[PDB]
Amino acid sequence: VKTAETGYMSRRLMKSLEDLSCQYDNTVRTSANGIVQFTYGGDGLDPLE
Amino acid sequence: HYAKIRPWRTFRLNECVCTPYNADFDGDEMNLHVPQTEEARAEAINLMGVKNNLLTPKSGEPIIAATQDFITGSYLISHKDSFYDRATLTQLLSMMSDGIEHFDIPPPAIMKPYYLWTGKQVFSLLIKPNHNSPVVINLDAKNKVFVPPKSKSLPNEMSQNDGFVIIRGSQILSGVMDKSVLGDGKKHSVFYTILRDYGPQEAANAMNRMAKLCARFLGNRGFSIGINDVTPADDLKQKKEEL
Amino acid sequence: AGQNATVAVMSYSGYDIEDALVLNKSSIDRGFGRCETRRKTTTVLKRYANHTQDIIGGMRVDENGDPIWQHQSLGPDGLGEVGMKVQSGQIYINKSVPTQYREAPVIYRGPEPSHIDQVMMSVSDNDQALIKVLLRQNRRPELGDKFSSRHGQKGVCGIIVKQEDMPFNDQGIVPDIIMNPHGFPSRMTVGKMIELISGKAGVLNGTLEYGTCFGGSKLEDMSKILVDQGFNYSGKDMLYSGITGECLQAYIFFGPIYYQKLKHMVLDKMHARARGPRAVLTRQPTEGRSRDGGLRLGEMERDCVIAYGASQLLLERLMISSDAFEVDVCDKCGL
Amino acid sequence: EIALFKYRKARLEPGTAIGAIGAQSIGEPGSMNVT
Amino acid sequence: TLKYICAECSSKLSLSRTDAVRCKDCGHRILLKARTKRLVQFEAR
Amino acid sequence: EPDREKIKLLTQATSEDGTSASFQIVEEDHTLGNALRYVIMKNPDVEFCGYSIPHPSENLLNIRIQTYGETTAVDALQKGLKDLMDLCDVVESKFTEKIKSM
Amino acid sequence: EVAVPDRVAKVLTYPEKVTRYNRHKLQELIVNGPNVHPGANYLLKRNE
Amino acid sequence: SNIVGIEYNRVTNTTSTDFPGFSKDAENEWNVEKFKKDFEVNISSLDAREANFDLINIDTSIANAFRRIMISEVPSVAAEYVYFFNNTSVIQDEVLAHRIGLVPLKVDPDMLTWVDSNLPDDEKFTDENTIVLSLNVKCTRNPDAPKGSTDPKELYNNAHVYARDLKFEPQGRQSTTFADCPVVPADPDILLAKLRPGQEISLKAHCILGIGGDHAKFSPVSTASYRLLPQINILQPIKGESARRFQKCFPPGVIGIDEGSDEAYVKDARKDTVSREVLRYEEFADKVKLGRVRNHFIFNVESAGAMTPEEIFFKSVRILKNKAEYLKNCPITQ
Amino acid sequence: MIVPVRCFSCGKVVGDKWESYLNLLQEDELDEGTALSRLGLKRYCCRRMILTHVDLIEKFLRYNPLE
Ligand SMILES: [Zn+2]
Ligand SMILES: [Zn+2]
Ligand SMILES: [Zn+2]
Ligand SMILES: [Zn+2]
C-alpha cells in the first residue's frame, strides 16, 4: 500500500506544478506569465545549493 | 552514464549509484535508453549526468555516496589499531589507483620500533594522493556512535571510541570513516566537501578510489559473521530471566 | 531442487555488495548449478473443407545432395532430426498450407542454439495430424542468474572467480559460493547460521540432520560433533587468502548451505530493440518482450526529465525516436 | 571570498523547473486520536 | 532407412505418405521419431 | 624476434626521471604480480611497488614502481625479474636434492 | 560509467553523421560490419 | 616476529615484514646466497598420487604462487570434443560429453603439442596434438539370469558403462610412440552412464591438452594446497586433571602427558587442525599461547592421475621461472 | 540424476566411489560415515557429493521404451 501512494502523490502534485519556472525576471511564473512568487522562497536561493 | 562495453549479458552500474535507483542486485532489471540526436545527447550528459546529480534537489544532501560494504571496509582501515608498513601500504595505495596514480608517501606515524602508517594516513592519500592534487579539505564531523569525552571540558575529539573526525588540510587527524562521513545523508560528508570546494570530477575521482580499494582490501583482510556473533554469553542468559 | 554449496560467509571482491554472490568457476565447470531447459512446439496439420490438407515439406538441397542452411537440421521427411543442433533461423518443421502450397515453416528464433531431443508424430481426436517437437537446451551459470538459499535471501551472480583466487582452508577446500555478511543483520536469518553448522556437523558425522520447526538438531551438540573432528565449534575456520597467500585476519564462517537455482535467468531476460515492428493503429513500437520489443517511457519518467529541464531529450525520447510523423497542416483551416 | 562566492552559487538559476522539482520533493519520501 | 519408434510397443515402422499413425502390431497412435544417423559434435565443457 | 605487446610503459603515469613508472603487462595475474611485488620491494632503492588488476574481464595487469633518485624504475623492474628467476633456481635445486636423496 | 553487454551494443546503434573529423574512423566501422563490435549495422546515404 | 598470532576473535601479524625499510635498521635485502642458506625442503611422504612436503623459510607471495601454478596453469590432457554416434540412453549427449571430458587420463602431457585455434578445422588435429578415445557399448538383456533378479549386473550384460570402456585408437605414429604407455583413464571405474536393453552409446572423443584456468577439467591436481605449521606454546605449565582436559582440547595425537601430573607437554604440533578450542576456556587462557609459523609451509599435493605429484611441483616452479624469464627478455614498449 | 564424476569444490574424483559406497552399506554394513572414510573422503566438500546424492537414473530408466 506504500508503493501505490508514493507514486500517486507526486503524480498529482505534478499536474499543478509542471509549468512553473524561475524566469530571468527572478520571479516564478506560470504558463500564462502570472506571478506565483515575486522571488523564490523570499530570498531567491536554490535548495540544492 | 557513459557506456562501457563488456562481455557478459547484464548491466553493471557501480554500487555507489544503486542508491538513487533504490535497487539491489537480487534479480531486478533496469532500462537503458540510447539518445539519438546531438542535442539530446548533450542535454542528457550535462543535466542528467551522474557527476552533476550527486546531490538530491530535495534538500541538497549527498545521495550518491558509499554503499553498505564500502563503509565497512573503510571503517576497518581507519579503525584506531590498523598499522601498515611500506610493503602493505603501497600495495594498498595501488588497489585504489590501478597502478597509475602517483603517490607521495608521508613520513610514518610511528618510527622507532618499526615504520608504521596508521589507517588514517591511508585515507588521507585517497583524498589527495600527491602534492599535484588540488583537493585540500577541512571538515569536522561526528560519527554515528559518538561516545562523548570523559570530562565536558575536553572538546569533542578527545572522545571515547574515537568518534569525532577532524580533517585538516586533506588529512585525517582523528575519527573513523563511516556512514556519517561517507554515506548519503550528511552535509559534512567527506565526498560532499570535495564536491562543494573542487567540483564534480574530484568528488567522483575520490569516490572511485574508495570503491576500488574497499573492493580489493576486504577480501584480503577478511570480515565475516558467525553463530558466535549472535550467541549470548551465559551472564546475559541469567540476567535476562531476572529483568 | 538444489545443490549443497560450500559457502564461505565473507566479504570478497566487492562484486557481492547488495545481494550479489561470488561464484566459483571450477565449480561451474564440474556441474554446480548447471540446468537444462525444454520447450514444446505444436503444429497441427489441419485438413480443410476444400478437401485439401496441410502438408509437411521436404529437404531442399542445392547444387548436389546437401541441404541449404535452413534445412541443415531437417531430415528427409520435413520434421527435424532428433539430436541435431538448431540455431537462430533454421527450420525444424517444414509445413506448407494450401494445388499451390504456401510455405509456412516454423523457424527457431532463439538467441542461443538448442538440440532437438524428441519429435512426436501423432493424431488427435478429430483425425488430423499433431506434431509436437521438444527442444532441449543446456545452460550454465552466467553473470546474472538467480540463486537462493532456503531463507528468503535471493541473490544474483555477480562474478565468477578462477578457483586459485578463492580462499582455502588447511585441507584445501574452496567455497562454491561466497556470501556477504551484510545480508544477515538487517534480515535476521539466524536459522541460516544454524543450517550451516548442522550441515557441517552432519556431513562430518555422515548423517543428515534436521532443522524442523520448533525442534530439529541442537546447536550445542552439533558443536560437539564439530570439535570431535578438530573443527571449531562455531563453524568459523581460519581461511587463507587465494590472491595473496596470507592468513585472513578473521575466522571465516564456512560450511555447506543448500542453494537452489531459480528460473529467472538472464539469457531469458536480456533483450534490446533498435527498430522493429510497429502497432498498426498507434504506429509506435510494439508491446511485450517476446516481440522485438519497445520499452515504455511513461508518465513518471517524463516527470523526471522535465525536472532536469532537458527539453530536447524529452523532444527526442518521446517524439523523434518513438513516433515521428511528417504531416501537412492547413493554415487557414487548421486541419 | 569563500562565503560570497558560495552565495552567488546558491541563487536559483533562471529556466529551472522549480515547480517540477518541488512536486517530487514532497510526494516522494516516506496527540490523542489525530491523523 | 527405418525410423519412428512406437510409443510403448517400441516397434519400428517407416511411414508412407498416407498410411496411418497406427503402430502395426500394436494399434497405438503415438510415434516417436528415432535418433538421426548423423554425427553430432559436442565440446566437453 | 621480440614480443612487442607483452609489456608496455604507461607513459601517462611515469615521471621524466624514470624513477616512477607504470607497466601494463598482459596475460598475467596475481601469481606473477605478487611474486614480483615481493622481490621488487626487497630492493634498497624501491620506495613503492604495487600491482593491480584493474578489471577482471581483462587479462592484464599494471605494476607500479617508484624508486628513489638512484635507479630508473625500468632497472628496478629488470632487477626484480632477475631475482625472481634466481629464487626458483634455489627452489628447483633443493627440491630435487631431497627427492633424489629419498 | 555503466557496463553494457556487447550483445546489446551490437543492436543499439548511434546515427553517427560523417564529417571531416570522423571520416577515417567510420570507414573502419563499415568494413567491420554488423557482426563484430567496433562495427555498424546500417548506412544511410546523403540522398538515397 | 614470524609467528602469526591466533586469538579467539581475530588473527594478528599476518604480513611479510622482511623488506628493507621496515625499520631503521634497513636489513633483509635480497641476497640470493643468503636465501640459499636459509631455504630448506623436507619430504614427509611421497606416493604415486600424493606428495607431502615442507617449504621452509620463504615468503607467502612465492609459496602461494607455486600453489596457483599447480591449480591453474600446469597443463594436462583431457577430452575436449565428443562425436556421438547413436546415443539412445537417458543421459543427454551434452551431459554425457561433460562427464567424459571430466575423467582423468594417463597421458603424459610432454608427449603432445598445443593445438591451435587460428588454423582451419581439418588440419587442426594432428597426431601430435590430439588423442582419439572411443567408447562403444550396447546394453542387452542377459538371458541367463538368476530368478531373484534385482541387481542389474546379472540382469543385463552391459548395464553400466564405466571409464575403462573408453578404448584408445592410436592415430598415425601413436601406435609406436604410445606403444609402451596406452591411454588408460587413471580411475577406470568412474561410472559414466548406465543403460537398459535397447539403449546404446557409441562415440569418439578427441583429447587435447590445456590448463586449469581454461576449464577445471584440465587441472592436474585433486587439491594442491598448503598450510602453515601451528606452534603451541604452553606458557606456565599445566598439570593434574587440568592437563587431562588440556589434552582433550586438541586433536588426540597432538599433546602428550609425561608421567601423569608432572606437566602437559606438546608432542606433535604438526598434527592439529587449528580450532582454538582452548581459547574458549578461561582457565587455560593466560596459560597457553598458540600461534602459527608464517615461514613454514606444509604442502600437500595430490594428483588426479596423469603425472606424479612431485613432477607437478617441479613443473610449477619451472613455469613461474619461465614467466619471469620471458618478461625480462621482452622489450618495454614506451 | 547420476553421480558427479568429481567433487565440485576440489575436483577429487568421486564418481568411482558410488558403486563401492553402496556395497559398504548394503553388505558388511557401516554407519554411512565410516563407509565414507573407508572410501577415503576426508574433506567435507567431498563427503557431501555422495552422501546427499539422490540417484535418479535408476528411476528414469524404468520408463524407457522396452526396446
Ligand atoms: Zn484548409
Ligand atoms: Zn506399438
Ligand atoms: Zn565432478
Ligand atoms: Zn572436494
Curated annotation (Swiss-Prot), chain C:
Zn(2+) binds at residues 330, 333. Transmembrane segments: none annotated. It is found in: Nucleus. Belongs to the RNA polymerase beta chain family. DNA-dependent RNA polymerase catalyzes the transcription of DNA into RNA using the four ribonucleoside triphosphates as substrates. Second largest core component of RNA polymerase III which synthesizes small RNAs, such as 5S rRNA and tRNAs. Proposed to contribute to the polymerase catalytic activity and forms the polymerase active center together with the largest subunit. Pol III is composed of mobile elements and RPC2 is part of the core element with the central large cleft and probably a clamp element that moves to open and close the cleft. Present with 1950 molecules/cell in log phase SD medium. Component of the RNA polymerase III (Pol III) complex consisting of 17 subunits. This is DNA-directed RNA polymerase III subunit RPC2. It comes from Saccharomyces cerevisiae (strain ATCC 204508 / S288c). The lineage of its organism: Eukaryota, Fungi, Dikarya, Ascomycota, Saccharomycotina. The chain holds residues 751 to 1100 of 1149 of the full protein.
Curated annotation (Swiss-Prot), chain E:
It is found in: Nucleus, Nucleolus; Peroxisome. A zinc finger (C4-type) spans 6-26. GO terms for molecular function: DNA binding; DNA-directed RNA polymerase activity; zinc ion binding. Transmembrane segments: none annotated. Zn(2+) binds at residues 6, 9, 23, 26. The N-terminus is blocked. One of its GO terms (biological process) is transcription by RNA polymerase I. One of its GO terms (cellular component) is RNA polymerase III complex. Keywords: DNA-directed RNA polymerase, Metal-binding, Nucleus, Peroxisome, Ribosome biogenesis, Transcription, Zinc, Zinc-finger. DNA-dependent RNA polymerases catalyze the transcription of DNA into RNA using the four ribonucleoside triphosphates as substrates. Common component of RNA polymerases I, II and III which synthesize ribosomal RNA precursors, mRNA precursors and many functional non-coding RNAs, and a small RNAs, such as 5S rRNA and tRNAs, respectively. RNA polymerases are composed of mobile elements that move relative to each other. In Pol II, the core element with the central large cleft comprises RPB3, RBP10, RPB11, RPB12 and regions of RPB1 and RPB2 forming the active center. Present with 907 molecules/cell in log phase SD medium. Belongs to the archaeal Rpo12/eukaryotic RPC10 RNA polymerase subunit family. This is DNA-directed RNA polymerases I, II, and III subunit RPABC4. It comes from Saccharomyces cerevisiae (strain ATCC 204508 / S288c) (Baker's yeast). The gene is RPC10.
Swiss-Prot record, chain G:
It comes from the Eukaryota. It is found in: Nucleus. Belongs to the RNA polymerase beta' chain family. DNA-dependent RNA polymerase catalyzes the transcription of DNA into RNA using the four ribonucleoside triphosphates as substrates. Largest and catalytic core component of RNA polymerase III which synthesizes small RNAs, such as 5S rRNA and tRNAs. Forms the polymerase active center together with the second largest subunit. A single-stranded DNA template strand of the promoter is positioned within the central active site cleft of Pol III. Present with 6020 molecules/cell in log phase SD medium. Component of the RNA polymerase III (Pol III) complex consisting of 17 subunits. This is DNA-directed RNA polymerase III subunit RPC1. It comes from Saccharomyces cerevisiae (strain ATCC 204508 / S288c).
UniProtKB/Swiss-Prot annotation, chain I:
Zn(2+) binds at residues 7, 10, 45-46. GO terms for cellular component: nucleoplasm; nucleus; RNA polymerase I complex; RNA polymerase II, core complex; RNA polymerase III complex. PROSITE patterns: RNA_POL_N_8KD (PS01112). Disulfide bonds: none annotated. Gene3D superfamilies: Homeodomain-like. Pfam families: RNA_pol_N. GO terms for molecular function: DNA binding; DNA-directed RNA polymerase activity; zinc ion binding. There is a cross-link at residue 59 (Glycyl lysine isopeptide (Lys-Gly) (interchain with G-Cter in ubiquitin)). It is found in: Nucleus, Nucleolus. Keywords: DNA-directed RNA polymerase, Isopeptide bond, Metal-binding, Nucleus, Ribosome biogenesis, Transcription, Ubl conjugation, Zinc. One of its GO terms (biological process) is termination of RNA polymerase I transcription. NCBIfam families: PRK04016.1 (NF003089). Belongs to the archaeal Rpo10/eukaryotic RPB10 RNA polymerase subunit family. HAMAP family: RNApol_arch_Rpo10. DNA-dependent RNA polymerases catalyze the transcription of DNA into RNA using the four ribonucleoside triphosphates as substrates. Common component of RNA polymerases I, II and III which synthesize ribosomal RNA precursors, mRNA precursors and many functional non-coding RNAs, and a small RNAs, such as 5S rRNA and tRNAs, respectively. Pol II is the central component of the basal RNA polymerase II transcription machinery. Pols are composed of mobile elements that move relative to each other. In Pol II, RBP10 is part of the core element with the central large cleft. Present with 5300 molecules/cell in log phase SD medium. This is DNA-directed RNA polymerases I, II, and III subunit RPABC5.
